Predict the structure of Spike glycoprotein,Fibritin,Expression Tag.
Amino acid sequence: VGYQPYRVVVLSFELLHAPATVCGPKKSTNLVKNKCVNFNFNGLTGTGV
Amino acid sequence: TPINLVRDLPQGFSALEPLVDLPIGINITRFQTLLALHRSYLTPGDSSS
Ligand SMILES: *[C@@H]1O[C@H](CO)[C@@H](O)[C@H](O)[C@H]1NC(C)=O
């Protein structure tokens, strides 16, 4: 078993001054309307209908 | 924008809607354009004269 071939893949992640290009998945809750709710559409934390 | 003229660009107004966005983050100070020339049967086909 120890002499059998094994495939090894190594992942490396680095940070530079460039804007981030690789991002993980995001979640999305259901849209409720005509009610005083709070939303955050990527630019503001607005509360309202 | 379609137009029917050779020179002396018209005084009409036409805004420029945005196009694709490049998140590169590099240095830039110089630029140059690219042109296309034709090699028909009239020309000998050499890029000298
Ligand atoms: C190019 O960008 C780098 C960092 O973004 C900066 O240090 C450098 O001075 C820039 N070069 C020029 C010619 O502006």
Observations:
- Chain A touches chain B at residues 17-19, 21 (CB under 8 Å).
- Residues B 27, 29 surround 2-acetamido-2-deoxy-beta-D-glucopyranose (CB under 6 Å).
